[PDB]
Amino acid sequence: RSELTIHPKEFTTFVRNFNPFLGATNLHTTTDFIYEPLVVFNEMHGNTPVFRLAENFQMSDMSVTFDIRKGVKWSDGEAFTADDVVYSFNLVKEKPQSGINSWVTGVEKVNDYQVKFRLSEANSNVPYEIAKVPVVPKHVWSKVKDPSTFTNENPVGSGPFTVIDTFTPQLYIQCENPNYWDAANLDVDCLRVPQIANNDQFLGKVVNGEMDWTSSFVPDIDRTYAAASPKHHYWYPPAGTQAFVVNFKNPDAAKNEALTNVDFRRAFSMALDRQTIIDIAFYGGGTVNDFASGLGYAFEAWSDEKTHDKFKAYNSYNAEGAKKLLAKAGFKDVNKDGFVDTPSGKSFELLIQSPNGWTDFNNTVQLAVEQLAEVGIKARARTPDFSVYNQAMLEGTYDVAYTNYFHGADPYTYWNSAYNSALQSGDGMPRFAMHFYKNEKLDGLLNSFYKTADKQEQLEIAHGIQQIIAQDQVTIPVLSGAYMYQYNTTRFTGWWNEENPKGRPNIAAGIPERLLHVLDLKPV
Ligand SMILES: CC(=O)N[C@@H]1[C@@H](O)[C@H](O[C@@H]2O[C@H](CO)[C@@H](O)[C@H](O)[C@H]2NC(C)=O)[C@@H](CO)O[C@H]1O
Numbered sequence: 050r051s052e053l054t055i056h057p058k059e060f061t062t063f064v065r066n067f068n069p070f071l072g073a074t075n076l077h078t079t080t081d082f083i084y085e086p087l088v089v090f091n092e093m094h095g096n097t098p099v100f101r102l103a104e105n106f107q108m109s110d111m112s113v114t115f116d117i118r119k120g121v122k123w124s125d126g127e128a129f130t131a132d133d134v135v136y137s138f139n140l141v142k143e144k145p146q147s148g149i150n151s152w153v154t155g156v157e158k159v160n161d162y163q164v165k166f167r168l169s170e171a172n173s174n175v176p177y178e179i180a181k182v183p184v185v186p187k188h189v190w191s192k193v194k195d196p197s198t199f200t201n202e203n204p205v206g207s208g209p210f211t212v213i214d215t216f217t218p219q220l221y222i223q224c225e226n227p228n229y230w231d232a233a234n235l236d237v238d239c240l241r242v243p244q245i246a247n248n249d250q251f252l253g254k255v256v257n258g259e260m261d262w263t264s265s266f267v268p269d270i271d272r273t274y275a276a277a278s279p280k281h282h283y284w285y286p287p288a289g290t291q292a293f294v295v296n297f298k299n300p301d302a303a304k305n306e307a308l309t310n311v312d313f314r315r316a317f318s319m320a321l322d323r324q325t326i327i328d329i330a331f332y333g334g335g336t337v338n339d340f341a342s343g344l345g346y347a348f349e350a351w352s353d354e355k356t357h358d359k360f361k362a363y364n365s366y367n368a369e370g371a372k373k374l375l376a377k378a379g380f381k382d383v384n385k386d387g388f389v390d391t392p393s394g395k396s397f398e399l400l401i402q403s404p405n406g407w408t409d410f411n412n413t414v415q416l417a418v419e420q421l422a423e424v425g426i427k428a429r430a431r432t433p434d435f436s437v438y439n440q441a442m443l444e445g446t447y448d449v450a451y452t453n454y455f456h457g458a459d460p461y462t463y464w465n466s467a468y469n470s471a472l473q474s475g476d477g478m479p480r481f482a483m484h485f486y487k488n489e490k491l492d493g494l495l496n497s498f499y500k501t502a503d504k505q506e507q508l509e510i511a512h513g514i515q516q517i518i519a520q521d522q523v524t525i526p527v528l529s530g531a532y533m534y535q536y537n538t539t540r541f542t543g544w545w546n547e548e549n550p551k552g553r554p555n556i557a558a559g560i561p562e563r564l565l566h567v568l569d570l571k572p573v
């Protein structure tokens with residue numbers, strides 16, 4: 050039988066948790082692979098909707114109706130009906146997701162193959178959001194203990210791989226669903242998932258040809274990995290923004306004083322050599338992002354160039370100008386250590402964090418630390434475990450953090466996740482908006498992005514968002530990165546690549562297109 054060796058997320062050890070709602074404790078082969086979505090949007094191809102469990106959807110003259118494919122059965126033989134979708138959306142309406150429920154007011158079963166979704170506000174992006182919610186078996190989950198602390202070790206599933214073949218703390222094997230509706234399109238028998246804690250461990254394995262489908266950072270990829278075998282390939286199409294995020298609500302006076310000063314964020318930004326960061330840390334694998342709004346050149350067409358030009362000096366390498374701005378603002382060194390102190394005369398050191406084992410970001414931070422020291426800003430690096438890293442952002446105890454962002458077909462994915470202040474509160478919230486900068490006009494502009502179908506007005510919305518973020522230098526954007534993807538042609542063929550660019554190729558959870566991707570691979 051064919052086994053596909055994948056690596057969607059680093060772990061020290063595997064805990065048997067296949068619950069789709071628990072995205073902080075589950076295995077990252079649960080969404081898509083076990084619970085197939087209604088629709089997959091091919092974001093690389095203009096969000097073209099690829100229909101799976103749903104046959105179609107129809108916005109009413111305004112709310113949506115989904116039609117659900119017939120003859121579709123769960124893993125245990127029981128049939129997939131509207132009742133299963135109905136029971137699923139119903140369940141998060143009274144037990145909160147991460148997806149966000151701020152868009153759907155209840156659900157009607159209307160037909161055992163048609164479901165009515167009632168809308169809170171009106172949003173043309175709402176099928177994209179509905180697609181994120183996992184549909185679970187009604188005939189199974191309606192039992193359940195506490196649906197919130199429920200490991201799902203033996204999962205009833207709709208997706209391609211539902212059988213747990215093997216399960217050690219360093220290896221688990223996830224095999225073909227017995228009653229899979231698309232099994233005719235499926236030629237991979239099993240997902241084979243090894244436990245890998247960080248990039249150093251990954252690197253030995255990938256260079257030894259032990260992997261099939263991976264998305265980790267690989268330093269000097271052409272020398273280390275590609276040169277080791279003719280079967281060793283990769284394809285890095287462009288992805289989203291990377292930046293230093295600063296905490297506007299730091300609990301230390303001096304640090305708060307520094308971080309909340311726009312002069313100081315702009316001097317911080319100007320000391321950075323973004324091209325050198327790309328060159329050394331990412332081995333050339335990226336593009337300088339000198340948009341103060343973090344827009345990035347892939348969305349250059351969306352850009353109000355007046356705004357970009359106006360603030361780009363603040364987002365270009367200019368240590369001398371960084372030194373002058375610090376002095377004009379009042380960050381004077383008054384204790385003879387060569388490091389500027391706050392206007393009220395306090396010494397400080399910024400602690401800059403990135404996740405343990407994400408060595409590309411670790412190196413970016415260490416590069417920035419030295420760059421900062423050159424213009425007299427004192428900083429130190431920290432590389433905590435992702436969960437610690439993430440937690441420090443959620444509770445606002447960090448100073449400065451290097452982070453990447455998710456990336457969409459337009460700039461809304463980046464701008465909303467990164468700046469909508471409503472995403473600063475909750476408890477299943479991601480790290481992305483946790484600078485705690487807040488602007489009602491910015492939030493209003495974001496909230497109205499998909500409110501009108503006037504492309505011209507949507508574009509004026511973008512320019513208004515761009516201007517607000519840029520003039521306030523809310524973060525320090527550094528670069529635009531790549532979709533890291535490595536593939537082995539030793540055991541399989543049919544891979545997406547530069548010659549076959551059918552969509553986002555990565556294996557990470559959060560890329561629904563990985564389902565469509567595995568449906569193209571054939572054993573060799
Ligand atoms: C936007 C986001 O949070 N994406 C996450 C990915 O960055 C992350 O993958 C890891 O990214 C690091 C930084 O570039 C790499 O150093 C690292 O190799 C890579 N790890 C893997 C297994 O791909 C993944 C997984 O941690 O989570 C994504 O959500």
Ligand SMILES: [Ca+2]
Nearest residue numbers: 382383384388
């Ligand atoms: Ca000093």
Ligand SMILES: [Cl-]
Nearest residue numbers: 340341342357
């Ligand atoms: Cl800009």
Ligand SMILES: [Mg+2]
Nearest residue numbers: 234235568569
């Ligand atoms: Mg196929």
